[PDB]
Amino acid sequence: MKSVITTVVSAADAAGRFPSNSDLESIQGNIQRSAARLEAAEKLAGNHEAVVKEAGDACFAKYAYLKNPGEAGENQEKINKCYRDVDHYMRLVNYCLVVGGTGPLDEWGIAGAREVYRTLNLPTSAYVASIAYTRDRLCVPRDMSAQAGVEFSAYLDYLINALS
């Protein structure tokens, strides 16, 4: 998993040397920013079904053509799996808010996603539009704190730039 600890022990293992002062200095900042990212992750965990419901209809509101026959959102089985995949992506974002890095995103949602979405005829723009809608409905004092919103929108922009 790409995180703060793993990068520096992997670098020290590649160099074959003991943990120096720079490695521990990198963990002090993890201690600092965990006060914001953990209470971002907790607020995402406590209210996730509202956000997954709210961002799911923005996809079909922007792209109403998916419910036509021949498309990828015809019957209820496709829309249910659409909501399930959006919930999967929100869970991976909650995981990356906890681990401190983009590890769980890069390995459980991003790597290999392009071949699946091209093969199974899933348009990536509508997998993107839900994440884009989720980012813009984030006010600074209401939904979370100030740094928690920065920490949340950074992972949202990472997922958006990965799928686009």
Partner: protein
């Protein structure tokens, strides 16, 4: 050993009680052992030197070494005799420069290395800030150490495998609600009745949809199979008694653009909660 002020702090033991370095000497009873070591080796006349490990040095004795010191009195006696040195009189901190040897009262000669203000008596560093104290009566000089002088000859039987390896017992963190509910699933179904399904948990709202089709707990109870023949006329009543309310008055709340609706269809099943019920409080029958 009675009171340190009475007659000031002139007596030998009271003077040291007034100093703050080695309180452990009287906290325990090493003062009696060291007195017996000053009579067993006739150290009284010849001017000797003593190295005292201060407080904190005593507080950092390893548990397996402290256990050995408290289960063998000859070990304590040897360790204490190894802190009293007759080799070169009552020397100050300006006579220990260089790398040489000192002769203990009993043990074998112990190497010391003094480089300016940083003096080591082997395994232990002298605290220069509070030392070089010469007592005229009973002539000897006193120095303070950061650690007990522990020769390798005495701590050869002390091992961490002998039962001092640090272990912290782990504990569970369940709740009363969870345990009360789960205990009903430990009785046979012919006895437990409805409670036999009490080990199931809420699942993500999409697990109840077409592909997966997870069953809720309300589907295992007779409430989901009630379809009686009789019915209520809903006309016999005088006007003004029947009441009707919707869940909302809005097009795209009762049914969004997509098919994900909580009020119309078969998708009102796809909700995060509602996966279990608290109707197992009634009875076991």
């Amino acid at each position: 050993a009675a009171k340190p002020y009475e007659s000031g702090y002139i007596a030998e033991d009271d003077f040291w009680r007034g100093r703050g370095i080695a309180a452990w000497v009287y906290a325990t009873g090493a003062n009696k052992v060291i007195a017996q070591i000053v009579k067993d080796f006739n150290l009284t006349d010849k001017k000797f030197m003593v190295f005292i490990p201060n407080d904190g040095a005593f507080a950092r004795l390893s548990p397996q070494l402290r256990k050995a010191m408290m289960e063998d009195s000859r070990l304590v006696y040897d360790m204490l005799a190894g802190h009293i040195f007759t080799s070169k009189g009552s020397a100050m901190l300006k006579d220990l420069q260089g790398a040489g040897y000192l002769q203990p009262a009993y043990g074998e000669a112990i190497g010391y290395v003094g480089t300016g203000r940083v003096i080591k008596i082997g395994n232990a560093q002298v605290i220069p800030e509070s030392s070089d104290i010469l007592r005229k009566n009973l002539g000897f000089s006193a120095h303070t150490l950061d650690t007990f002088i522990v020769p390798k000859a005495l701590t050869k039987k002390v091992s961490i495998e002998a039962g001092f390896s640090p272990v912290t017992p782990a504990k569970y963190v369940s709740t009363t609600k969870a345990d009360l509910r789960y205990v009903g699933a430990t009785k046979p179904a012919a006895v437990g009745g409805r409670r036999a399904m009490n080990l199931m948990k809420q699942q993500p709202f999409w697990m109840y949809g077409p592909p997966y089709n997870a069953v809720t707990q309300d589907e295992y109870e007779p409430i989901s199979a009630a379809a009686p023949k009789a019915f209520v006329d809903y006309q016999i009543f005088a006007p003004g008694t029947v009441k009707v309310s919707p869940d909302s008055v809005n097009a795209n709340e009762l049914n969004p653009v997509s098919g994900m609706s909580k009020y119309i269809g078969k998708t009102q099943k796809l909700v995060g909660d509602q996966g279990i019920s608290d109707r197992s409080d009634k009875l076991p029958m």
